[PDB]
Every structure is written in C-alpha cells, then in structure tokens.
Amino acid sequence: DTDLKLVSHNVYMLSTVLYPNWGQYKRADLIGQSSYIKNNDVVIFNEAFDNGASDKLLSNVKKEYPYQTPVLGRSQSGWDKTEGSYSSTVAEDGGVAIVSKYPIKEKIQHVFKSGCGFDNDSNKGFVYTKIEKNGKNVHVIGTHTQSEDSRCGAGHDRKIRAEQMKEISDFVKKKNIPKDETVYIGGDLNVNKGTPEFKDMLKNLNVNDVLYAGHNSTWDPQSNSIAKYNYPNGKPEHLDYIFTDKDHKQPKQLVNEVVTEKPKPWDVYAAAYYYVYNDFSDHYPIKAYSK
Ligand SMILES: [Mg+2]
C-alpha cells in the first residue's frame, strides 16, 4: 500500500587510490546488471566510498531508480539538511546513499557524532528519505555503523554502535513522523544475529525483529570469494538488516532475505598477483519485503 520492497547492500566500493585493485569499476557494472538490484522500490547502499566507482554504480541504476540521494558526507549540496559531525576536512565520505523508484520528497544526511578517533576520517552516519508512493508517505533511513575494528576494541565498538543507533532513534523521535507511516531503518548494522548485542540493537534502534529467509549470514568467509580472501579464518556473521521503527505502522509481515546471487567471474590482473572473484561485494545483499 505504502509497503516497500527494498534492498540494502554494502558494496565494498573502497577508495581506488588506497585499494586500486578491488574491481570497483567492474563490480559497479556487475551490480547494475544483477537481478537482486532490480525490481525493488528503494535500495540502500553502504561503502559507496570511491567517488568515481560509486557514481558509476549510481548511474548504472538511475533508469530504474531515478530519485537518488547524494552520498553521505560528500558535500552539503543536494540535501534538505545536513546534521551531525559533518566535516569538510575528511578525505572519505560516509559511503551511504539511497535510490528510489518513487520521488524522494525530503533527504537529510546525518554524520555520526559518536565514533573512533584512529579511523574518524569518515563521515559515517545515516541518510533519511521520505518517499511518496501512491500519494502517501513512507520513510527510509539507510545507515552503516561502527565496524568490529580490532584497534578500537570490541567493547568500544559495541558502545560506539549503541550510541550511533541512539542517534538514529533520537532523530526518528525528534522528527515526529506520524505513527501511521512506516519508518524503515536498514543497512550494515554490524551486530551479529543471535548475540547479546542483538537485543541491544533492537532496543537502541527502537525496532521489532523480522522473519528471515535465504542464507544465514551476510558476511561469509566460507562462501563469499571476497570475504574468503580477506579473512580466510573468519566466522560468518549476519550483519545487514532492514527493520522498521516499532512505534510506527508495520509492514504486513516484514522479511529479510539474504541474497546469494553471484556475478560471472571477474578478475584483477594486479602486477603482483592474478586473482578471480565471483561476488559483488564481501557482503551479501538483503532483500526486504512482505509476502
Ligand atoms: Mg566492509
């Protein structure tokens, strides 16, 4: 009715200056040609860091999703409001963008005030959109929260995520969005399913849990060729979600499906080594919808 089909995907579009050989441009095209990216209402991207590769990706999906936000933290242009700890002086944007098949009526970027000082060179945060479907409004917040960084510390990473999630939920409450409109909150939330922290996330984001489908992890060194390479030893975890605020209208029966679609194999002929991969990113995308 106003309920949406969404995808969220951390696309691993690292800086092509710092990480020249991660197939960023090749993957921007493959993602655009994929099936999972198609036939949704709204797509949330995370780790759209490299400006050129990210803009290519966004361009690759513009015909289907003509209404697009800028990428979080790139500049103040194109936003209805910029808030949080927005910095001109950070070399890296926040990598979050939202595209929509339906007109975006309002777009706000919020760079997180909470974070870690020895990788604070990112405008990480959330992007809020109000979207009009069938003359009615629906709200989508896309985000990407503090990674499990071995330098900041596990305990600190968890506290950072808590505060960042509270920034989102505070934003939602202060926005005074009428309770008869749904507010989706999704992205790479970096909290593993089935953990003590997971219960905290539901409270801090003010969301209900969802029904799950498909694969049982979203970052999976056992089946994903990119994750496998980077962290051969890694435990698969389920880190990407799309939830709705629990005090606003609920979808009929929200599902999060972890999609394991793979592109045709693609290579990087680095001077040092040759490598072949067959994933869009080191994370799998989530598709959310109600059946
Ligand atoms: Mg990552």
CATH number of 210's domain? 3.60.10.10
Dihedral over Cα of 242, 88, 149, 161: its sign: negative
Residue 246 belongs to domain spanning: 1-291
CA of 247 to the centre of ligand 1 (A): 31
CA of 174 to the centre of ligand 1 (A): 30
CA of 54 to the centre of ligand 1 (A): 15
Say if residues 221 and 233 touch (Cβ distance below 8 Å): yes
* Cα–Cα distance measured from residue 105 to residue 222, given in angstroms and rounded to the nearest whole number: 41
Question: Which residues are part of a known binding site for Mg(2+)?
Answer: 47
Question: Which residues are part of a known binding site for Ca(2+)?
Answer: 47
Tokens, residue 230:
């980077």
CA of 134 to the centre of ligand 1 (A): 35
Give the N- to C-terminal CA distance of the chain in Å, as an integer: 13
CA of 246 to the centre of ligand 1 (A): 28
- In 156-285, beta strands by DSSP E: 183-188, 211-214, 240-244, 254-258, 266-269, 274-277
CA of 12 to the centre of ligand 1 (A): 6
* Cα–Cα distance measured from residue 280 to residue 45, given in angstroms and rounded to the nearest whole number: 12
How many domains does one find in the chain?
Answer: 1
How many Cβ atoms are within 10 Å of 212's Cβ, its own excluded?
15
CA of 145 to the centre of ligand 1 (A): 10
- In the chain, beta strands by DSSP E: 6-13, 42-48, 67-68, 81-84, 97-100, 104-111, 125-133, 136-144, 183-188, 211-214, 240-244, 254-258, 266-269, 274-277, 286-290
Three-state DSSP class for residue 27 = helix
The label of the residue with tokens 């194109």 reads: 78
- DSSP code of residue 92: B
φ, ψ of residue 253 in degrees (nearest 5): -165, 85
Question: Which residues are part of a known binding site?
Answer: 47
What does the angle CA 67 – CA 72 – CA 76 come to, to the nearest 5 degrees?
Answer: 90
Amino acid at 8: S
How many Cβ atoms are within 10 Å of 265's Cβ, its own excluded?
10
Nearest-CA neighbor of 58 among 8, 99, 108? Answer: 99
* Experiment used for this model: X-ray
- DSSP code of residue 101: S
Long-range contacts of 225-229 (CB under 8 A, 24+ apart): 225/276, 225/277, 225/278, 225/279, 226/12, 226/277, 226/279, 226/281, 226/282, 227/279, 227/282, 227/283, 229/275, 229/277
Nearest-CA neighbor of 109 among 72, 136, 143, 75? Answer: 72
Q: Which residues pair with 125 in a beta bridge?
A: 111
* Cα–Cα distance measured from residue 68 to residue 64, given in angstroms and rounded to the nearest whole number: 11
* Cα–Cα distance measured from residue 143 to residue 47, given in angstroms and rounded to the nearest whole number: 10
CA of 90 to the centre of ligand 1 (A): 18
Decide the pairing of beta strands 67-68 and 97-100.
antiparallel
How many Cβ atoms are within 10 Å of 84's Cβ, its own excluded?
22
Tokens, residue 165:
């999630």
* Cα–Cα distance measured from residue 220 to residue 260, given in angstroms and rounded to the nearest whole number: 10
* Cα–Cα distance measured from residue 177 to residue 185, given in angstroms and rounded to the nearest whole number: 14
Nearest-CA neighbor of 257 among 234, 283, 285? Answer: 285
* Cα–Cα distance measured from residue 106 to residue 230, given in angstroms and rounded to the nearest whole number: 38
CA of 47 to the centre of ligand 1 (A): 7
The label of the residue with tokens 């209900």 reads: 208
Q: Which residues pair with 131 in a beta bridge?
A: 104, 138
Tokens, residue 33:
């040609």
Q: Which residues pair with 141 in a beta bridge?
A: 128, 185
Say if residues 63 and 90 touch (Cβ distance below 8 Å): no
Burial of 219 (0-12, 13-18, 19+ CB in 10 A): buried
CA of 117 to the centre of ligand 1 (A): 18
The label of the residue with tokens 């309002």 reads: 106
CA distances (Å), 80 to each of 106, 110, 112, 165, in order?
6, 11, 17, 22
Nearest-CA neighbor of 127 among 202, 59, 68, 181? Answer: 68
Neighbouring C-alpha atoms within 13 Å toward the C-beta of 58? 25
Say if residues 68 and 78 touch (Cβ distance below 8 Å): no
Tokens, residue 144:
């990407």
Q: What is the resolution of this structure in A?
A: 1.8
Say if residues 181 and 131 touch (Cβ distance below 8 Å): no
* Cα–Cα distance measured from residue 135 to residue 181, given in angstroms and rounded to the nearest whole number: 12
Nearest-CA neighbor of 46 among 218, 247, 175, 173? Answer: 218
Amino acid at 152: C
